[PDB]
Symmetry: C4
């Protein structure tokens, strides 16, 4: 169309995409100030008014660029994200949870979508994630199995830490991060169950070894790429 | 045999091995629910009945596939494991410790045996372990030597941490993981023995250095393999 | 000039640059003793007298070598540093903050400027920093976004940790370092907000993954250099 | 000599060196039991008698093999070690400190000297240490500079942590290991000095970055060796 091409050379234009990047950064400062109580008592109104100005601007633009690109728009990871955070954003406050108001703050991630240098590095990081899946598999299972013995051994006498399969899952996640694993968990346990270290000193070893391998794994696969290039 | 070949094309068949993978996952959910007290009051019976249905199914199948494969079955790492967790499983409750009931939960690791993609990655992880043996050697010795001085210096005045060669071994294992090493151990010690940091700041250095090397070691040996391939 | 060349073969001479390296090390021992209260009661005077002897010596030499090298001197990173720590040093005590007196202690970093082997390794370390910028970018943004939800969710009931966008930034920096993240932060939170782990167990994962990549990233880029050499 | 060659084919013989490896392991078990109080009340005598049997055996053998090898013996790292732990060992108890009795326990490291596979890996680990010297240099200096400001800023109001240049050095060593750096140090400080995070959040960054580089450094230098081989 003699206009469909005038609409595309608008949307696909630099100024338009660079414009909503200046409207991203102007909004991220606003979210920053809006947490201030002092700022909110004075400049609260402008702000909440400013916040409606943008959301129609984006719904304008999410409408424009979904028209420009029709059904291709919907098989794009970045675009779908922009659709699903604007959508999230459009449903208003005091309806349902208000946790959605705090989730609205995800729309800042658009700056990663809109900025190419940023979508590059995010594609790097995600490019890594298929290779580690089998380890994440094995690993999840391993946690599962130990959550179950740990509950079965300790949940009745240590209910804050092991009375639930999830309570155990969590504590175990923490012990893996080595976070007060001894003085705060294993050591308190050996006051009652004195051979508790048999369960944890092995558990630490396996998940640390598995981690070390997971990482050497990334570093070797990052290397097949260099020699191949 | 005109049947030994009908028994092999059963056992070695996809549906049969994929069948006991669906009987693995159905059992792992059951172990999950069985930790719940609510679930156990209602659906306890079905469950404990379900648990006997499987164990005869596996002892059926561990019998079948030990017949199909005779004495080869017994020099296979995965198969031996399946024999030794089913065996563990067959001895019943309220005999000996009941810690064996919690050890029964190891039979979930069959999912790593039955799933090829999973036995692949487990063979990777174990493939690594010969190379690090000399470091694990040196390392064990080093811990040993320090357990002995640490007991000899601190066990009489700090018996929860150093009165035993093992008590020391453990605390030292913990200090290596940097887990409250200072605010919870070395610092409390310098209230009595003020030059205790002479023992620990060196000890941290050596075991951290040895670890860093152990890891660079894995990463270099993972590299001889790439250029060789 | 028949003297400009006699001034250059002084400044650019070994003995002159090696001289102010012996005047660096003599001064760093002095700063060391000067923290002692005993030393300061006796040898305080000599010392504070000694400290004025050097600062005129350096302002002598910073004047000489800025003359020898005119405006080239001012586009050199090491030289500019030497200018800006001597300058810092020249403004005296009891004027403004006295935090500048503690900042005077930065002039020890001249030993890294004056010693080539040392400016080599510092140029290595800084040589690394362009490549990680996009990750430091993404990363800063990510922290920002979570500071804002974390304040919005927890600052009213946990003001020491989340009542400020910065208070949150800090706590979050700490949680990233895994430092009492559970027993000291997330666990205290679940006494009031029981699904707080939904915010933190994801947050730990993302920033740990991003870190692992940041590091594998350094190691791969250090490798393009070897094959290229 | 018609005997100097009979003395060398003794010392240099397998059985002789393998003999004192069985006398090493028999002694290391003895040190292990000797920490037990029960064992020492019964079998104490045998033991302390056993301990004199070996020390003359080694002084026999350290005499033999210093004769076999004359002055070459004294420029060998492993041999010198064996001389200097036996020497340490020969001076008896209740003279000077008794800390030397606990230092006698170092003679177990002979097992690393006597076992080739073990002296191999120890030579690997030490082979690494020249390359990191410039970083250990820079690093020591950096710690030094911060010890001095940290004392100058905090030692008067926090004397257990910063009243000494060494007290500071230690605390700083601990903060580097991230060990309760926040909840136990920086956080307690901001109750008095509220912009203390300006000193520590930078300090953590620099020493973590320097560490990451130190390690990528080992991994790259371990790689020049592979392509060169
Ligand atoms: C491409 C990538 C890795 C292979 C590669 O090319 N480089 C290494 C991906 C693509 C397909 C992936 C697997 C399957 O989806 C399912 C599989 C079964 C487990 O039960 C659950 C996860 C497993 C291990 C997955 C991870 C595995 O890692 C694969 C092979
Ligand atoms: C193959 C592998 C490493 C060599 C390799 O090919 N790549 C590296 C394995 C195979 C044989 C291994 C050693 C011996 O069992 C005993 C030996 C004596 C110590 O007192 C205790 C452990 C030691 C160091 C073992 C570890 C060592 O690592 C070896 C050489
Ligand atoms: C050379 C180096 C990396 C490329 C390379 O050669 N090796 C990898 C440097 C040089 C120029 C750098 C970027 C720009 O200054 C701005 C850019 C936009 C972000 O919003 C903020 C930071 C970004 C990602 C910077 C980091 C990036 O990493 C670049 C490409
Ligand atoms: C061989 C090795 C590294 C070079 C190499 O071949 N591979 C990297 C070693 C051998 C000689 C070493 C230096 C000197 O003793 C003194 C020097 C001055 C500092 O003020 C204090 C330490 C410095 C940086 C030392 C470390 C440096 O690392 C060198 C070059
Ligand atoms: C952008 C999308 C991101 C999707 C994220 C995908 C999840 C990836 C899982 C990686 C994170 C696992 O979570 C984290 O793993 C590290 C591995 O460094 C482990 O952490 C522990 O062991 C490793 C051993 O290698 C050490 O490096 C680390 O210092 C220690 O704390 C813990 O298990 C946990 O802190
Ligand atoms: C599937 C079978 C598995 C068999 C397991 C074989 C055991 C292998 C030993 C490796 C585990 C040693 O146990 C663990 O080692 C790590 C090394 O990362 C050390 O951990 C500490 O030092 C290292 C330095 O490299 C850091 O990476 C780590 O963050 C820190 O906590 C501790 O010593 C201990 O937490
Ligand atoms: C000389 C000038 C220096 C300029 C400094 C530039 C800043 C560079 C940023 C690197 C430092 C980031 O700060 C530090 O990052 C490490 C990454 O190891 C993270 O630390 C955590 O995760 C990583 C996972 O890789 C683990 O290695 C580490 O043991 C764990 O504590 C934390 O986020 C923080 O402790
Ligand atoms: C056999 C002789 C041995 C001689 C020993 C020579 C000393 C070598 C110095 C290396 C040890 C430095 O001491 C240790 O360094 C590690 C680096 O992993 C740092 O540790 C911290 O930062 C690093 C970042 O890389 C992380 O890997 C680590 O999990 C974290 O705790 C600390 O600074 C200290 O725990
Ligand atoms: Ca900790």
């Amino acid at each position: 169309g003699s206009m469909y091409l005038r609409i595309t050379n608008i949307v696909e234009s630099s100024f338009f995409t660079k414009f909503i990047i200046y409207l991203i950064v102007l909004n991220g400062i606003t979210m920053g100030l809006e947490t201030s109580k002092t700022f909110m008592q004075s400049f609260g109104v402008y702000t909440t008014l400013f916040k409606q100005i943008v959301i129609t601007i984006f719904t304008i633009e999410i409408i424009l660029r979904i028209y420009v690109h029709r059904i291709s728009f919907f098989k794009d990871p970045w675009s779908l994200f922009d659709f699903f955070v604007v959508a999230i954003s459009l449903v208003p406050t005091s309806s349902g949870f208000e946790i959605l108001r705090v989730l609205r703050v995800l729309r800042l991630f658009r700056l990663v979508t809109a900025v190419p240098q940023m979508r590059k590095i995010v594609s790097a990081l995600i490019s890594v994630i298929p290779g580690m899946l089998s380890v994440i598999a094995l690993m999840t299972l391993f946690f599962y199995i130990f959550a179950i013995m740990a509950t079965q051994l300790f949940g009745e006498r240590f209910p804050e830490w092991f009375g639930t399969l999830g309570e155990s899952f969590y504590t175990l996640f923490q012990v893996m991060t080595l976070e007060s694993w001894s003085m705060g968990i294993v050591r308190p346990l050996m006051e009652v169950y004195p051979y508790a270290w048999v369960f944890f000193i092995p558990f630490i070893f396996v998940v640390t070894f598995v981690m070390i391998n997971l990482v050497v794994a990334i570093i070797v696969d990052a290397m097949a790429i260099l020699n191949q290039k």
